[PDB]
Short mmCIF file of C-alpha atoms (C1' of nucleotides) in Angstrom, two decimals:
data_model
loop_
_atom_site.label_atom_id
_atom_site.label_comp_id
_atom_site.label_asym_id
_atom_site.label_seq_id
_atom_site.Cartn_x
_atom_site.Cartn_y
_atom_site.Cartn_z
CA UNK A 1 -92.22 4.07 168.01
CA UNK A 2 -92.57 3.56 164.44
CA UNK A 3 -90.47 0.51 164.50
CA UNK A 4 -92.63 -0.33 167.68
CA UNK A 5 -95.54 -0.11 165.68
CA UNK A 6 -93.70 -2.25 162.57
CA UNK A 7 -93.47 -5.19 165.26
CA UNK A 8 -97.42 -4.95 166.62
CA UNK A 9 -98.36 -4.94 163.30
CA UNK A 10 -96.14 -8.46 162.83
CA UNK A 11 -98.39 -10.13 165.37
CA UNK A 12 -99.23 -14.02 164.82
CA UNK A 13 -96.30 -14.65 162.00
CA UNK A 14 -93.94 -17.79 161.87
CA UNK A 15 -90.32 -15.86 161.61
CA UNK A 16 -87.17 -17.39 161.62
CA UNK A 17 -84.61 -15.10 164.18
CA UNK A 18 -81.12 -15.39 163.92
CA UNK A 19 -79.35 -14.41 167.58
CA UNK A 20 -75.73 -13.01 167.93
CA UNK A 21 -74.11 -16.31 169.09
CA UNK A 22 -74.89 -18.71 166.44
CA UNK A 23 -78.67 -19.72 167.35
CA UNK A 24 -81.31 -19.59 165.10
CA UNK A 25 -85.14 -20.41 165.91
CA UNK A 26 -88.22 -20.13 163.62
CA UNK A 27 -91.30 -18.99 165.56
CA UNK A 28 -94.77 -17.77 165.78
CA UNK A 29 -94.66 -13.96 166.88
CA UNK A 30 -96.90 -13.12 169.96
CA UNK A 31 -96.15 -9.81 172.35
CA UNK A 32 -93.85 -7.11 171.25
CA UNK A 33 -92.71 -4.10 173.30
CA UNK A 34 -90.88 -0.94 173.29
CA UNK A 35 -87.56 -2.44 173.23
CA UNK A 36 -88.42 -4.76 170.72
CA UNK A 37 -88.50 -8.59 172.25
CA UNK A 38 -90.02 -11.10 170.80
CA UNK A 39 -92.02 -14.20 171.89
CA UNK A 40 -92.56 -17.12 169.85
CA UNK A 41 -94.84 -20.04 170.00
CA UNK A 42 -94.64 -23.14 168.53
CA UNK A 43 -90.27 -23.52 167.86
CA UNK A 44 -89.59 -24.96 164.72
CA UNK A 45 -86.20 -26.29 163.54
CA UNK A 46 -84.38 -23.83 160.53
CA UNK A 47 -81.16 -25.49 160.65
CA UNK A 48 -79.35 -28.97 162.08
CA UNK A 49 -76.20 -27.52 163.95
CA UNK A 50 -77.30 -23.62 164.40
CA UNK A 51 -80.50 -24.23 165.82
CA UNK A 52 -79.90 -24.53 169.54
CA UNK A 53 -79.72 -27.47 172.16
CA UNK A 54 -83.98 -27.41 172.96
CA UNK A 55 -86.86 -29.15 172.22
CA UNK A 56 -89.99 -29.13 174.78
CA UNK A 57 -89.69 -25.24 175.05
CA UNK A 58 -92.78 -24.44 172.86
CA UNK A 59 -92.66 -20.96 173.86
CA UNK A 60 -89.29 -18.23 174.54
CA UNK A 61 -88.49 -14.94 175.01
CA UNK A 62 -86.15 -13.28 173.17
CA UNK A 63 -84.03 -10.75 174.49
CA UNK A 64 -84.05 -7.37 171.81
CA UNK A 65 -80.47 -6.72 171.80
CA UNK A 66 -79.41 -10.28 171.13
CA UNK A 67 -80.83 -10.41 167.40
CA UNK A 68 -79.09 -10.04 164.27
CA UNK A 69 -82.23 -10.04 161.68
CA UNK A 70 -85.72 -10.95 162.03
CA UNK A 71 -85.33 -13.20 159.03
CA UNK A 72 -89.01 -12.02 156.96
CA UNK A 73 -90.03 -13.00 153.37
CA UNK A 74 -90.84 -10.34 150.95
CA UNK A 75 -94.69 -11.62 151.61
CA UNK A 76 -94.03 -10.36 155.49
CA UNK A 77 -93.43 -6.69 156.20
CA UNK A 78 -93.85 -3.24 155.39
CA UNK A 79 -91.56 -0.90 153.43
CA UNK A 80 -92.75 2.75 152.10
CA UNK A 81 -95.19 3.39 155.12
CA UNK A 82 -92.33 2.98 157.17
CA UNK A 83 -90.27 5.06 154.88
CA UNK A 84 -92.76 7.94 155.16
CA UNK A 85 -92.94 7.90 158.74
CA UNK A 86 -89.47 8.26 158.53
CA UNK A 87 -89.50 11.36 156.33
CA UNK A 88 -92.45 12.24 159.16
CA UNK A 89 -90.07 12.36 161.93
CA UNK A 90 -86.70 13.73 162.59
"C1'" G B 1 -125.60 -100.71 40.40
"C1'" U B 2 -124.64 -101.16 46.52
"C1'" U B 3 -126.10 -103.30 51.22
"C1'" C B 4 -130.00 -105.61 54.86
"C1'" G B 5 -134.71 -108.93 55.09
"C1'" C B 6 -138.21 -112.63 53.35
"C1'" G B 7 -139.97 -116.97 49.33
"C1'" A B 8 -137.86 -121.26 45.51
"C1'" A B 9 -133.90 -124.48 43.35
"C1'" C B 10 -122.48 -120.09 49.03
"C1'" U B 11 -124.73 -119.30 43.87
"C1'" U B 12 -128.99 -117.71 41.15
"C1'" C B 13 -134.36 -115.95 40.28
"C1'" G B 14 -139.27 -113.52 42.94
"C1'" U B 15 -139.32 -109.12 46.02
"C1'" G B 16 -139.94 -104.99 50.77
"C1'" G B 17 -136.89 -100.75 52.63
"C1'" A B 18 -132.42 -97.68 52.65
"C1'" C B 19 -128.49 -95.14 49.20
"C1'" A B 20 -126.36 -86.62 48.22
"C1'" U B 21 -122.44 -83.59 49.35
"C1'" U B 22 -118.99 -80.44 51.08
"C1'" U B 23 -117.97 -74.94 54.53
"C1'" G B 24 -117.61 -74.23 59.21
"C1'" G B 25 -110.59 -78.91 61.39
"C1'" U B 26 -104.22 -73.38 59.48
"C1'" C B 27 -100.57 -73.80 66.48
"C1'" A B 28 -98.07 -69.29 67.40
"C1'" A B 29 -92.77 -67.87 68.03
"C1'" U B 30 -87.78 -67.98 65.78
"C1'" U B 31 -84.08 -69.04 61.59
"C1'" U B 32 -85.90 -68.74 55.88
"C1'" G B 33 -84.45 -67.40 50.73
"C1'" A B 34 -88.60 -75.37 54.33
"C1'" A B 35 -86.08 -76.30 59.16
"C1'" U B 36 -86.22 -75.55 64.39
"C1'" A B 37 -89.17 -75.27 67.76
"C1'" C B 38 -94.06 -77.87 70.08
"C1'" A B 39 -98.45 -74.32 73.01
"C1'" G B 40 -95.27 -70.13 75.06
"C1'" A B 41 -92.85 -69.05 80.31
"C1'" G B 42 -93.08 -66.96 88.88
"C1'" A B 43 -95.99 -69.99 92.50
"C1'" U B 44 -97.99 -70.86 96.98
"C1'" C B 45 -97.97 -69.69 102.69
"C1'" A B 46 -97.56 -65.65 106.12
"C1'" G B 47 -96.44 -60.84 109.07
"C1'" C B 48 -96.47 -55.56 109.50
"C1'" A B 49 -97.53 -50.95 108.73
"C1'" G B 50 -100.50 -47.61 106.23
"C1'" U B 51 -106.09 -45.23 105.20
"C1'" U B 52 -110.97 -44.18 107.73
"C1'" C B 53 -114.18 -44.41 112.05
"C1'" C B 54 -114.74 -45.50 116.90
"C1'" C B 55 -113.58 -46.46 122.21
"C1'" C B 56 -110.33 -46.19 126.11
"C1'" U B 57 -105.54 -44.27 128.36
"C1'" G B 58 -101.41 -40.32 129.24
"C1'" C B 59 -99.41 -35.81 127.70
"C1'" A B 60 -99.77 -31.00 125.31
"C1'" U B 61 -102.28 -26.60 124.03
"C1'" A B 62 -106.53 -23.54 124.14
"C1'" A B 63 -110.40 -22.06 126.51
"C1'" G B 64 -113.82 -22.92 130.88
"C1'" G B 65 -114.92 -24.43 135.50
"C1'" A B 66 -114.67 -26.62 140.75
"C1'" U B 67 -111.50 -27.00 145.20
"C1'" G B 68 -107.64 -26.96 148.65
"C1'" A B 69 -103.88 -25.17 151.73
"C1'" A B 70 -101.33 -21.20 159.14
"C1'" C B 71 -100.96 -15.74 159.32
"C1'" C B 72 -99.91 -11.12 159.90
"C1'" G B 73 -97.86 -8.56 155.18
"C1'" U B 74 -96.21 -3.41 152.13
"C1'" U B 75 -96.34 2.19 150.69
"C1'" G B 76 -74.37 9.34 184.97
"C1'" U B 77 -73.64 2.42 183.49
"C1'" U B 78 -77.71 -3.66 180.82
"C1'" U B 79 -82.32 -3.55 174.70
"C1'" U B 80 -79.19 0.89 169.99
#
RNA sequence: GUUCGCGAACUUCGUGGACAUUUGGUCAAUUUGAAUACAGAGAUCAGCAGUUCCCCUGCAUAAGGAUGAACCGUUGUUUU
């Protein structure tokens, strides 16, 4: 739930995601849910031989488990509210 | 006395003017104990940069504005 909440609060942001079998697609973050998915519009090259065979498919869904990283910037997240929510739970 | 002019028989008589003078004119230079010299030793033409002041242009520093750029940021067996 707090890393639920992380994700929500990531809504509308171009982020590059890195999958488990050598695909990786920038994107604009839509929906998240409890499992963590991801939707992107607007798919944007990162790399020439990673990045996967598409190229009309403007919008995906991206199954949770699959991901590596959700490749952010340090001008993209948050850190120590996370870290006391943390502490907050057990 | 010395010249120029005119009257009478170049020559001479009768005659009217004019008749100072010197200073102010030393080549220097060198060889002398008068000779050599011989007037005395760079020119002309043309660039460029400098200096100052200006104007433009590009860069730098200081300051000081104006404006742009998407989008959210941080304190009982498949997704664990």
């Amino acid at each position: 739930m707090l890393f639920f909440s992380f994700f929500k609060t990531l809504v509308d942001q171009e982020v590059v995601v890195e999958l488990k079998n050598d695909i990786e697609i920038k994107g604009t973050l839509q929906s998240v849910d409890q499992f963590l998915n991801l939707k992107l519009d607007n798919i944007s090259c990162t790399d020439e031989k990673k990045y996967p065979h598409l190229g009309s498919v403007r919008n995906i869904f991206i199954r949770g488990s699959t991901v590596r990283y959700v490749y952010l910037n340090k001008n993209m997240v948050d850190t120590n509210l996370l870290q006391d929510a943390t502490r907050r739970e057990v």
